[PDB]
Amino acid sequence: VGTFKAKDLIVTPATILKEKPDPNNLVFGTVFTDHMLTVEWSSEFGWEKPHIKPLQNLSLHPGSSALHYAVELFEGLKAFRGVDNKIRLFQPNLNMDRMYRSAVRATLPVFDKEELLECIQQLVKLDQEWVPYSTSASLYIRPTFIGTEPSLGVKKPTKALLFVLLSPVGPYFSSTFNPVSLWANPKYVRAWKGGTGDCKMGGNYGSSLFAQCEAVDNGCQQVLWLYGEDHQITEVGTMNLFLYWINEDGEEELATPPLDGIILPGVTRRCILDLAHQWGEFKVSERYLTMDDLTTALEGNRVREMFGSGTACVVCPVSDILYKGETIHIPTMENGPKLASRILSKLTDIQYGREERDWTIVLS
Amino acid sequence: VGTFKAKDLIVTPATILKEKPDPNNLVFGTVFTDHMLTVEWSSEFGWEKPHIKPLQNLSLHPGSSALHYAVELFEGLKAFRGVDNKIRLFQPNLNMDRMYRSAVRATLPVFDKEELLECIQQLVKLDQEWVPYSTSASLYIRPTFIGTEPSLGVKKPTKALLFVLLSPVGPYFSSGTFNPVSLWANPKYVRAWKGGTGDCKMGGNYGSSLFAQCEAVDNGCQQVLWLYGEDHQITEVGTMNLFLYWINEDGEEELATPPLDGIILPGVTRRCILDLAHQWGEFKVSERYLTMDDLTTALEGNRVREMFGSGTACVVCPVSDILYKGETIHIPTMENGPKLASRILSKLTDIQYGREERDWTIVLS
Ligand SMILES: Cc1ccccc1Oc1cc(-n2c(=O)cc(C(F)(F)F)[nH]c2=O)c(F)cc1C#N
Ligand SMILES: Cc1ccccc1Oc1cc(-n2c(=O)cc(C(F)(F)F)[nH]c2=O)c(F)cc1C#N
Ligand SMILES: *Cc1c(COP(=O)(O)O)cnc(C)c1O
Ligand SMILES: *Cc1c(COP(=O)(O)O)cnc(C)c1O
C-alpha cells in the first residue's frame, strides 16, 4: 500500500495550444483544456510516476473492468478565478477524503490524498489560463479512477488508471435563478441500504439515465429520488435536497435527509449545514422527509423554500414536483427565495475570494 | 432509429496468428482470440457498418460515459465443440433478447437481434479453431456495449461502441468433478433493489459486488449469498441463480428458485433448468420466495436435499455451507448425491456438446 508522489511528476507540455471558449456560451463538460494528469497502477509494481501531458484518447484493453463491471469512480470539484484574480480551490481535502473512501469500497488501490491534491494543483496551475475570466464561471476538475484489468474475471483489479480532466464551465443556468420542476416517480430507486449510493462510483449513475429521460419527456429538468414504503424525498438528480419550512413542532427548520447510506455526502451539503449551525437563527435537522410531510406542510402554508445543493449549482431552487399525475407547486420563488439567495451569496463570496475563509486554498 | 446489418460486415483478417492455449490449462477470461467485432454508433448518423478485425486496444475519449457513469452492458454465452466436431451455440437468442432489453434500460441505442447474432456467428466462424478441442472446454463470447460520449454531462449517450470479444475457457473447476462452495451471507450488502437494474446485465450491478466478494474470500468462502429485505430472502449465489431442492412446508418434493420480481437476473441456465423440471413432471417446481429462516427451519427437519448455483459459467455449482450470523450452516447437497444437480449437469452438457439433439442448439453458420 504505497503511492505516486507529486515530487516525481513528469510534465510533457503541449507544443500546440487550443483557443479558450467564450465563458457565456459554455455547455457543461463539453470542452476540455490542453493537459490531463494520468497515473498507471499494477498489483505487481504499484504506482508508476504521475504524468501531466497533452489531452489524449486512453488506449484501453477491451476487457478493462471499467467497461464490463463498472470498476470506476470519479470526483467533481471546481477552481475559481476570484475578484482579486487569485485562483482558489474550495474544500478540495473533502473531495480527496471521499475519493479515497470510494476507492476502498470499489477495491481500487489506495493513494496518498495530499499527493493527488498536489498533482491536481500542478495540473490546474499549468492550465490556469483555462480558469475562466468571469465571476460566474469555473474550471471543473474531474478526477477519474478506472480498473484496466485485461481479464473478464469478476475480481479486484490488478491494473488501474487514475487520471484528471479539466473542463471550463459557465454559470449553471445561461440566463439569476431558473427554478426547476422535479419528476417524482417511486417506480425508480437511485440507491438502497446495503448499496453504494454514498460513494461517487459510476454504477450509481448509469441506472439513473432512463428516469432522467422520463423526467425530460414530462417537461421536468431533474428527478426527485423517492425511497421506501413512505416515499422519502432523498436527492434532486445528482444534488442534495434541502427543505426550509415550519416543522411539525411549529419551529423554523432547515431540513435535509441524513447520511444513512442512500445519500451522497455532498461538500456543498456539509458547507450549508455548517453555515446554518453557525448562524444559529433557526433549527437545523438531518432527518427523514416524506412526500406526505411535504404535501401536509404545503396545505398548511408551512413551506418557504426547497433547493438542490451541489458543486454543479451551489443552490438550485425547486418550484414544482410532478407526483401521482398532479403538478405540486413549491412556493420557493414567492418567498424570495430569501435563504437560498443568502446561501448562494455566502458560498459564492468564499469561492471567488470576496471574503476570506479556511474553506479556500490559493493555487500552489 | 435503425441497425447495423451482417450483410455490410467489413472483415480485416489478421496477417499474424497467435498460438492456441493448452485446453487443459485455461484460466477463465484471461486469453483472447485473433479477432473482435466492433460497431460504432452516433445519434447523428446511427449505426456504422460492423467490422471483424484483429483484437486491439479501444481508443476512447477520457470523458467516455462508460468510464464515468457506467453507461455499459455485457452478455455471456458459449460456443461448444461437440463430440461430432460441430460447433454449437446454446440458446443464443435468449442472450440477444436480454442484451436488447438491457440496452433499453441503459438508454443505449437498440439494434436488430438477428443481425448481431449473425455478426457473432461470422466472428466465431473466422476464429472457429479457437473453440477448444476438448469436450469440457468452450469459447466464451463477451458481447459488450459502452457509451463513448466525450461529455461529462450525465445523459443518454450520443455515441456508443458495441464490440464482441472471444476467450477460450476450460471447465469451471480444474478437477472436472464438483468442488462444492461455501457462501458468505452478510445482509449488510444488497446486490439489487426493486426499481433498480438487478434484472439487467448492466456493469453498475457488478462493480458494487467486488468488496463483498473479497470479504467472502477473507472468511474462506468462494461466493457471496445475496440477501434481500427485512426477512433475509436468499436471491443469488454470486453471479449465479440460486436453486433449492427440498421437502417444502406442505411435505412435497420441490425445486424452488426466487421469482423474477426485479431483483433476479433472468438467467438462461435458470430458464433451461425450470423448463426441464416442468417437463420431467416428477416433483413440484416453484418460483417462490426463500428466506434464511425457511432454509434453517428445513435443515433442523432434515427437509433439504440439494442447493446449487446455475449460470453459463458453471452449469450447476453445488453449495455445501453458508456462513451467516457467525455460524457455519451445513447444506447436505454432496451427501444427497448430488442426485438432481448431477442429472441437470449431464442433460445440459449432453445438449451443449451434441451428445443429444435439441431445439436449444444452433450449429455454426
Ligand atoms: C457531472 C456530475 C456527475 C455526478 C454528480 C454531479 C455532477 O456534477 C454536475 C452535474 C451536472 N448535471 C448533468 O450532467 C446532468 C443533469 C441532468 F439533469 F440533465 F441529468 N443535471 C446536472 O446537474 C451538471 F450540469 C454540472 C455538474 C457540475 N459541476
Ligand atoms: C464473467 C461473468 C460476469 C457476470 C456474470 C457471469 C459471468 O460469468 C462467469 C463468472 C465467473 N466468475 C467470476 O468471474 C468471478 C467469481 C468470483 F466470485 F470468484 F470472484 N466467480 C465466478 O463464477 C466465472 F468464473 C466464469 C464465468 C463465465 N462464463
Ligand atoms: C456529487 C453528488 C452530490 C453533490 O455533492 P457535492 O460535493 O456538493 O458536489 C449529491 N448527490 C449525488 C448523488 C452526487 O453524486
Ligand atoms: C449472468 C448472471 C446470472 C446467470 O446468467 P446465465 O444466462 O444463466 O449465465 C445470474 N445472476 C447474475 C447476477 C448474472 O449477472
Short mmCIF file of N, CA and C in Angstrom, two decimals, chain B residues 43-182:
data_model
loop_
_atom_site.label_atom_id
_atom_site.label_comp_id
_atom_site.label_asym_id
_atom_site.label_seq_id
_atom_site.Cartn_x
_atom_site.Cartn_y
_atom_site.Cartn_z
N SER B 43 -25.81 9.38 -32.48
CA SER B 43 -27.21 9.87 -32.64
C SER B 43 -27.35 10.54 -34.00
N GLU B 44 -26.28 11.15 -34.51
CA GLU B 44 -26.33 11.96 -35.75
C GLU B 44 -26.50 11.04 -36.97
N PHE B 45 -25.72 9.96 -37.06
CA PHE B 45 -25.62 9.11 -38.28
C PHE B 45 -26.17 7.70 -38.05
N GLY B 46 -26.37 7.29 -36.79
CA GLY B 46 -26.89 5.95 -36.45
C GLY B 46 -25.78 4.92 -36.46
N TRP B 47 -26.10 3.67 -36.81
CA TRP B 47 -25.13 2.54 -36.79
C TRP B 47 -24.24 2.59 -38.03
N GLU B 48 -22.92 2.63 -37.82
CA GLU B 48 -21.90 2.40 -38.87
C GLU B 48 -21.94 0.91 -39.24
N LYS B 49 -21.26 0.54 -40.33
CA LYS B 49 -21.14 -0.87 -40.77
C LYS B 49 -20.28 -1.63 -39.76
N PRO B 50 -20.63 -2.89 -39.43
CA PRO B 50 -19.87 -3.67 -38.46
C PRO B 50 -18.53 -4.14 -39.05
N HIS B 51 -17.51 -4.23 -38.20
CA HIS B 51 -16.13 -4.66 -38.55
C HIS B 51 -15.77 -5.91 -37.76
N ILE B 52 -15.28 -6.95 -38.44
CA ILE B 52 -14.48 -8.04 -37.80
C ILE B 52 -13.03 -7.75 -38.15
N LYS B 53 -12.18 -7.57 -37.14
CA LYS B 53 -10.79 -7.08 -37.31
C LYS B 53 -9.93 -7.64 -36.19
N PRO B 54 -8.58 -7.51 -36.27
CA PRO B 54 -7.70 -8.04 -35.23
C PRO B 54 -8.06 -7.45 -33.86
N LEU B 55 -7.96 -8.27 -32.81
CA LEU B 55 -8.08 -7.82 -31.41
C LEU B 55 -7.13 -6.63 -31.24
N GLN B 56 -7.60 -5.57 -30.60
CA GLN B 56 -6.85 -4.29 -30.46
C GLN B 56 -7.38 -3.54 -29.25
N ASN B 57 -6.55 -2.64 -28.72
CA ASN B 57 -6.98 -1.66 -27.70
C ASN B 57 -8.10 -0.80 -28.30
N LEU B 58 -9.02 -0.36 -27.46
CA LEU B 58 -10.04 0.66 -27.81
C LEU B 58 -9.41 2.03 -27.59
N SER B 59 -9.58 2.93 -28.56
CA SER B 59 -9.24 4.37 -28.44
C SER B 59 -10.51 5.09 -27.95
N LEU B 60 -10.56 5.40 -26.66
CA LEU B 60 -11.71 6.07 -26.03
C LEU B 60 -11.27 7.46 -25.58
N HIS B 61 -12.09 8.46 -25.85
CA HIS B 61 -12.02 9.79 -25.21
C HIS B 61 -12.08 9.57 -23.71
N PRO B 62 -11.24 10.24 -22.91
CA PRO B 62 -11.23 10.01 -21.46
C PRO B 62 -12.51 10.48 -20.75
N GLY B 63 -13.41 11.17 -21.46
CA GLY B 63 -14.73 11.59 -20.95
C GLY B 63 -15.82 10.55 -21.19
N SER B 64 -15.49 9.49 -21.93
CA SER B 64 -16.44 8.42 -22.33
C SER B 64 -17.30 8.02 -21.13
N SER B 65 -18.63 7.99 -21.30
CA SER B 65 -19.60 7.82 -20.19
C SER B 65 -19.45 6.44 -19.54
N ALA B 66 -18.93 5.45 -20.27
CA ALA B 66 -18.65 4.10 -19.74
C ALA B 66 -17.63 4.19 -18.59
N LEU B 67 -16.69 5.14 -18.66
CA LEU B 67 -15.60 5.31 -17.66
C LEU B 67 -16.09 6.10 -16.44
N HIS B 68 -17.18 6.87 -16.56
CA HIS B 68 -17.62 7.85 -15.54
C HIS B 68 -18.92 7.42 -14.86
N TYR B 69 -19.95 7.08 -15.64
CA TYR B 69 -21.34 6.80 -15.18
C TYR B 69 -21.76 5.38 -15.55
N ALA B 70 -20.79 4.50 -15.82
CA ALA B 70 -21.04 3.05 -16.05
C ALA B 70 -22.15 2.88 -17.10
N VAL B 71 -22.10 3.67 -18.17
CA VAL B 71 -23.05 3.54 -19.31
C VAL B 71 -22.57 2.36 -20.14
N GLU B 72 -22.92 1.15 -19.71
CA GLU B 72 -22.34 -0.09 -20.26
C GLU B 72 -23.21 -1.30 -19.90
N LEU B 73 -23.20 -2.30 -20.77
CA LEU B 73 -23.82 -3.61 -20.52
C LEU B 73 -23.03 -4.67 -21.29
N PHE B 74 -23.19 -5.92 -20.88
CA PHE B 74 -22.49 -7.08 -21.48
C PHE B 74 -23.42 -8.29 -21.51
N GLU B 75 -23.00 -9.29 -22.27
CA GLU B 75 -23.59 -10.64 -22.27
C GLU B 75 -22.47 -11.66 -22.08
N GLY B 76 -22.89 -12.88 -21.78
CA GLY B 76 -22.04 -14.07 -21.62
C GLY B 76 -22.77 -15.27 -22.17
N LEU B 77 -22.20 -15.88 -23.21
CA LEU B 77 -22.71 -17.12 -23.82
C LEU B 77 -21.51 -17.87 -24.37
N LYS B 78 -21.68 -19.16 -24.70
CA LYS B 78 -20.54 -20.03 -25.09
C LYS B 78 -20.82 -20.68 -26.44
N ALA B 79 -19.74 -20.98 -27.17
CA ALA B 79 -19.68 -21.89 -28.33
C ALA B 79 -19.01 -23.18 -27.85
N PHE B 80 -19.55 -24.33 -28.24
CA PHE B 80 -19.11 -25.67 -27.78
C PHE B 80 -18.72 -26.53 -28.99
N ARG B 81 -17.50 -27.07 -28.99
CA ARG B 81 -17.10 -28.12 -29.96
C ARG B 81 -17.67 -29.46 -29.48
N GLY B 82 -18.66 -29.98 -30.20
CA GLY B 82 -19.39 -31.21 -29.83
C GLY B 82 -18.61 -32.48 -30.14
N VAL B 83 -19.10 -33.63 -29.68
CA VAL B 83 -18.46 -34.96 -29.88
C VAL B 83 -18.39 -35.27 -31.38
N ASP B 84 -19.25 -34.63 -32.19
CA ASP B 84 -19.32 -34.81 -33.66
C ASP B 84 -18.47 -33.74 -34.37
N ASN B 85 -17.66 -32.98 -33.61
CA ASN B 85 -16.73 -31.92 -34.09
C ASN B 85 -17.49 -30.73 -34.70
N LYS B 86 -18.81 -30.64 -34.53
CA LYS B 86 -19.65 -29.49 -34.97
C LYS B 86 -19.72 -28.47 -33.84
N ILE B 87 -19.53 -27.19 -34.15
CA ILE B 87 -19.58 -26.09 -33.14
C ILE B 87 -21.02 -25.60 -32.99
N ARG B 88 -21.47 -25.48 -31.74
CA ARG B 88 -22.88 -25.15 -31.40
C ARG B 88 -22.91 -23.97 -30.43
N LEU B 89 -23.86 -23.06 -30.65
CA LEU B 89 -24.30 -22.06 -29.65
C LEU B 89 -25.48 -22.66 -28.89
N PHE B 90 -25.69 -22.22 -27.65
CA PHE B 90 -26.75 -22.69 -26.73
C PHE B 90 -27.69 -21.52 -26.42
N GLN B 91 -28.90 -21.55 -26.99
CA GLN B 91 -30.00 -20.58 -26.73
C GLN B 91 -29.51 -19.15 -26.95
N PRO B 92 -28.73 -18.85 -28.01
CA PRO B 92 -28.10 -17.54 -28.13
C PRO B 92 -29.14 -16.42 -28.30
N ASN B 93 -30.31 -16.76 -28.84
CA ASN B 93 -31.49 -15.86 -28.99
C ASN B 93 -31.85 -15.23 -27.64
N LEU B 94 -31.78 -16.01 -26.55
CA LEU B 94 -32.17 -15.56 -25.19
C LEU B 94 -31.18 -14.49 -24.71
N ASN B 95 -29.90 -14.62 -25.08
CA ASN B 95 -28.84 -13.64 -24.76
C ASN B 95 -29.10 -12.33 -25.52
N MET B 96 -29.41 -12.42 -26.81
CA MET B 96 -29.72 -11.24 -27.66
C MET B 96 -30.97 -10.54 -27.10
N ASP B 97 -32.00 -11.29 -26.69
CA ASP B 97 -33.23 -10.73 -26.06
C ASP B 97 -32.83 -9.88 -24.85
N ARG B 98 -31.98 -10.45 -23.99
CA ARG B 98 -31.56 -9.86 -22.69
C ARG B 98 -30.66 -8.64 -22.93
N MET B 99 -29.79 -8.69 -23.94
CA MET B 99 -28.90 -7.57 -24.30
C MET B 99 -29.74 -6.37 -24.78
N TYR B 100 -30.71 -6.61 -25.66
CA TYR B 100 -31.64 -5.57 -26.20
C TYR B 100 -32.34 -4.86 -25.04
N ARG B 101 -32.97 -5.65 -24.17
CA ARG B 101 -33.74 -5.16 -23.00
C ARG B 101 -32.80 -4.34 -22.10
N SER B 102 -31.58 -4.82 -21.88
CA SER B 102 -30.55 -4.13 -21.06
C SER B 102 -30.18 -2.81 -21.73
N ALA B 103 -30.02 -2.80 -23.06
CA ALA B 103 -29.68 -1.59 -23.82
C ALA B 103 -30.77 -0.53 -23.61
N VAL B 104 -32.04 -0.94 -23.61
CA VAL B 104 -33.19 -0.01 -23.45
C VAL B 104 -33.12 0.60 -22.05
N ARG B 105 -32.83 -0.23 -21.04
CA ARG B 105 -32.79 0.19 -19.62
C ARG B 105 -31.59 1.11 -19.38
N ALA B 106 -30.51 0.94 -20.15
CA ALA B 106 -29.27 1.75 -20.07
C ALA B 106 -29.38 3.07 -20.86
N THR B 107 -30.36 3.17 -21.76
CA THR B 107 -30.58 4.29 -22.73
C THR B 107 -29.52 4.24 -23.84
N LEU B 108 -28.87 3.09 -24.02
CA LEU B 108 -28.03 2.78 -25.20
C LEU B 108 -28.93 2.48 -26.38
N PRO B 109 -28.47 2.70 -27.63
CA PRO B 109 -29.33 2.57 -28.80
C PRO B 109 -29.68 1.11 -29.08
N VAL B 110 -30.92 0.85 -29.50
CA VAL B 110 -31.40 -0.51 -29.88
C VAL B 110 -30.72 -0.92 -31.19
N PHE B 111 -30.79 -2.21 -31.51
CA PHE B 111 -30.22 -2.86 -32.73
C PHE B 111 -31.09 -4.08 -33.08
N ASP B 112 -30.94 -4.64 -34.29
CA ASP B 112 -31.64 -5.88 -34.69
C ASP B 112 -30.90 -7.07 -34.06
N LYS B 113 -31.62 -7.87 -33.28
CA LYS B 113 -31.06 -9.01 -32.51
C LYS B 113 -30.53 -10.09 -33.46
N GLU B 114 -31.23 -10.35 -34.56
CA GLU B 114 -30.85 -11.38 -35.56
C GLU B 114 -29.55 -10.95 -36.24
N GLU B 115 -29.38 -9.64 -36.50
CA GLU B 115 -28.18 -9.08 -37.19
C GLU B 115 -26.96 -9.19 -36.25
N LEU B 116 -27.12 -8.96 -34.95
CA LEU B 116 -25.98 -9.09 -34.01
C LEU B 116 -25.61 -10.57 -33.92
N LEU B 117 -26.59 -11.46 -33.84
CA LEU B 117 -26.33 -12.92 -33.76
C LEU B 117 -25.52 -13.33 -34.99
N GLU B 118 -25.95 -12.92 -36.19
CA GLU B 118 -25.28 -13.32 -37.45
C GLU B 118 -23.86 -12.74 -37.43
N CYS B 119 -23.66 -11.53 -36.89
CA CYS B 119 -22.31 -10.91 -36.79
C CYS B 119 -21.43 -11.74 -35.85
N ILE B 120 -21.96 -12.14 -34.70
CA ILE B 120 -21.26 -13.01 -33.71
C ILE B 120 -20.92 -14.35 -34.38
N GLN B 121 -21.84 -14.92 -35.14
CA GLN B 121 -21.64 -16.24 -35.79
C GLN B 121 -20.48 -16.14 -36.78
N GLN B 122 -20.42 -15.07 -37.58
CA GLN B 122 -19.31 -14.83 -38.54
C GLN B 122 -18.00 -14.68 -37.76
N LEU B 123 -18.02 -14.03 -36.59
CA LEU B 123 -16.80 -13.82 -35.77
C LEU B 123 -16.29 -15.18 -35.28
N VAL B 124 -17.18 -15.97 -34.68
CA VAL B 124 -16.82 -17.30 -34.11
C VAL B 124 -16.35 -18.19 -35.26
N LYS B 125 -16.97 -18.09 -36.44
CA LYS B 125 -16.62 -18.92 -37.62
C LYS B 125 -15.17 -18.61 -38.02
N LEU B 126 -14.83 -17.33 -38.16
CA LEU B 126 -13.47 -16.91 -38.57
C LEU B 126 -12.45 -17.41 -37.53
N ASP B 127 -12.83 -17.41 -36.25
CA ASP B 127 -11.93 -17.80 -35.14
C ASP B 127 -12.32 -19.20 -34.63
N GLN B 128 -12.86 -20.07 -35.49
CA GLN B 128 -13.51 -21.33 -35.05
C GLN B 128 -12.46 -22.31 -34.49
N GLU B 129 -11.21 -22.25 -34.95
CA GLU B 129 -10.13 -23.11 -34.41
C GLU B 129 -9.83 -22.74 -32.95
N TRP B 130 -10.34 -21.61 -32.44
CA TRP B 130 -10.19 -21.21 -31.01
C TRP B 130 -11.19 -21.96 -30.12
N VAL B 131 -12.28 -22.48 -30.69
CA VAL B 131 -13.26 -23.29 -29.90
C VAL B 131 -12.51 -24.57 -29.53
N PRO B 132 -12.16 -24.76 -28.23
CA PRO B 132 -11.15 -25.74 -27.85
C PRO B 132 -11.51 -27.17 -28.28
N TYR B 133 -10.49 -27.96 -28.61
CA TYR B 133 -10.62 -29.39 -28.95
C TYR B 133 -10.62 -30.18 -27.64
N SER B 134 -11.73 -30.05 -26.91
CA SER B 134 -11.96 -30.60 -25.55
C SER B 134 -13.47 -30.57 -25.27
N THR B 135 -14.01 -31.66 -24.74
CA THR B 135 -15.47 -31.81 -24.50
C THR B 135 -15.83 -31.23 -23.13
N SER B 136 -14.87 -30.66 -22.40
CA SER B 136 -15.11 -29.97 -21.11
C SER B 136 -14.62 -28.52 -21.15
N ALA B 137 -14.37 -27.97 -22.35
CA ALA B 137 -13.99 -26.56 -22.57
C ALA B 137 -14.90 -25.93 -23.64
N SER B 138 -14.84 -24.60 -23.75
CA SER B 138 -15.78 -23.77 -24.54
C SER B 138 -15.04 -22.53 -25.06
N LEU B 139 -15.68 -21.81 -25.97
CA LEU B 139 -15.28 -20.44 -26.34
C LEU B 139 -16.30 -19.50 -25.69
N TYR B 140 -15.85 -18.63 -24.78
CA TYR B 140 -16.69 -17.60 -24.13
C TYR B 140 -16.83 -16.43 -25.11
N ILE B 141 -18.08 -16.08 -25.40
CA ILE B 141 -18.47 -14.94 -26.27
C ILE B 141 -18.92 -13.82 -25.33
N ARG B 142 -18.22 -12.67 -25.35
CA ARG B 142 -18.49 -11.49 -24.48
C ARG B 142 -18.91 -10.32 -25.37
N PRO B 143 -20.22 -10.23 -25.73
CA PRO B 143 -20.75 -9.01 -26.32
C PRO B 143 -20.70 -7.90 -25.27
N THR B 144 -20.22 -6.71 -25.65
CA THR B 144 -20.08 -5.55 -24.74
C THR B 144 -20.62 -4.32 -25.47
N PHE B 145 -21.26 -3.42 -24.73
CA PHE B 145 -21.95 -2.23 -25.27
C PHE B 145 -21.62 -1.05 -24.35
N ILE B 146 -20.90 -0.04 -24.84
CA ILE B 146 -20.39 1.07 -23.99
C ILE B 146 -20.79 2.43 -24.58
N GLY B 147 -21.17 3.37 -23.71
CA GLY B 147 -21.27 4.79 -24.07
C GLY B 147 -19.89 5.39 -24.27
N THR B 148 -19.68 6.11 -25.37
CA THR B 148 -18.38 6.74 -25.74
C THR B 148 -18.56 8.24 -25.95
N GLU B 149 -19.66 8.79 -25.44
CA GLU B 149 -19.97 10.25 -25.37
C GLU B 149 -18.75 10.96 -24.78
N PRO B 150 -18.09 11.90 -25.49
CA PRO B 150 -16.94 12.61 -24.94
C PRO B 150 -17.30 13.73 -23.95
N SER B 151 -18.47 13.65 -23.32
CA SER B 151 -19.03 14.73 -22.47
C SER B 151 -19.28 14.20 -21.06
N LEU B 152 -19.00 15.03 -20.06
CA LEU B 152 -19.11 14.70 -18.61
C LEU B 152 -20.55 14.90 -18.16
N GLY B 153 -21.41 15.48 -19.00
CA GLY B 153 -22.87 15.52 -18.76
C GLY B 153 -23.41 14.13 -18.47
N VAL B 154 -24.18 13.99 -17.38
CA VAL B 154 -24.90 12.73 -17.02
C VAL B 154 -26.16 12.67 -17.89
N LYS B 155 -26.08 11.98 -19.03
CA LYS B 155 -27.16 11.97 -20.04
C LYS B 155 -27.08 10.71 -20.91
N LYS B 156 -28.21 10.38 -21.54
CA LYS B 156 -28.31 9.44 -22.68
C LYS B 156 -27.16 9.72 -23.64
N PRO B 157 -26.31 8.71 -23.94
CA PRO B 157 -25.15 8.91 -24.80
C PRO B 157 -25.56 9.18 -26.26
N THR B 158 -24.81 10.03 -26.96
CA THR B 158 -25.00 10.34 -28.40
C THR B 158 -23.91 9.63 -29.20
N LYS B 159 -23.16 8.75 -28.53
CA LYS B 159 -22.02 7.99 -29.11
C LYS B 159 -21.89 6.68 -28.33
N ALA B 160 -21.84 5.55 -29.02
CA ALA B 160 -21.67 4.23 -28.37
C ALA B 160 -20.81 3.33 -29.25
N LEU B 161 -20.21 2.32 -28.62
CA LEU B 161 -19.49 1.22 -29.30
C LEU B 161 -20.07 -0.12 -28.81
N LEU B 162 -20.52 -0.96 -29.74
CA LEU B 162 -20.86 -2.38 -29.48
C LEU B 162 -19.71 -3.22 -30.04
N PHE B 163 -19.08 -4.04 -29.20
CA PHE B 163 -17.95 -4.91 -29.59
C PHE B 163 -18.12 -6.28 -28.95
N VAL B 164 -17.49 -7.30 -29.54
CA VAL B 164 -17.56 -8.71 -29.07
C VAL B 164 -16.14 -9.26 -28.98
N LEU B 165 -15.76 -9.74 -27.79
CA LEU B 165 -14.51 -10.50 -27.54
C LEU B 165 -14.83 -12.00 -27.51
N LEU B 166 -13.84 -12.82 -27.87
CA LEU B 166 -13.85 -14.30 -27.72
C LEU B 166 -12.67 -14.70 -26.83
N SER B 167 -12.90 -15.63 -25.91
CA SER B 167 -11.93 -16.10 -24.88
C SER B 167 -12.12 -17.60 -24.67
N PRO B 168 -11.15 -18.45 -25.06
CA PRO B 168 -11.25 -19.88 -24.79
C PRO B 168 -11.15 -20.12 -23.28
N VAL B 169 -12.10 -20.87 -22.71
CA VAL B 169 -12.15 -21.17 -21.25
C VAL B 169 -12.33 -22.68 -21.05
N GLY B 170 -11.71 -23.21 -20.00
CA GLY B 170 -11.74 -24.65 -19.66
C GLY B 170 -12.95 -24.97 -18.79
N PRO B 171 -12.96 -26.15 -18.14
CA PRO B 171 -14.03 -26.48 -17.19
C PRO B 171 -14.03 -25.46 -16.04
N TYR B 172 -15.18 -25.18 -15.44
CA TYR B 172 -15.31 -24.20 -14.33
C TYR B 172 -14.32 -24.54 -13.21
N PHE B 173 -14.29 -25.81 -12.80
CA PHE B 173 -13.32 -26.35 -11.80
C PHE B 173 -12.30 -27.23 -12.54
N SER B 174 -11.00 -27.01 -12.30
CA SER B 174 -9.85 -27.73 -12.91
C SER B 174 -10.04 -29.25 -12.87
N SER B 175 -10.45 -29.78 -11.71
CA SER B 175 -10.61 -31.23 -11.44
C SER B 175 -11.62 -31.85 -12.42
N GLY B 176 -12.57 -31.08 -12.95
CA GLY B 176 -13.67 -31.58 -13.80
C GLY B 176 -14.84 -32.10 -12.97
N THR B 177 -14.60 -32.63 -11.76
CA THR B 177 -15.63 -33.07 -10.78
C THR B 177 -16.19 -31.83 -10.06
N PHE B 178 -17.29 -31.98 -9.31
CA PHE B 178 -17.89 -30.90 -8.46
C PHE B 178 -16.95 -30.53 -7.31
N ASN B 179 -16.59 -29.25 -7.19
CA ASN B 179 -15.92 -28.67 -5.99
C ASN B 179 -16.95 -27.82 -5.25
N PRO B 180 -17.59 -28.32 -4.18
CA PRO B 180 -18.72 -27.62 -3.56
C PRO B 180 -18.23 -26.34 -2.86
N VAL B 181 -19.02 -25.27 -2.95
CA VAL B 181 -18.64 -23.90 -2.49
C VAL B 181 -19.26 -23.62 -1.11
N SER B 182 -18.58 -22.76 -0.34
CA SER B 182 -19.11 -22.07 0.87
C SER B 182 -19.56 -20.66 0.47
#
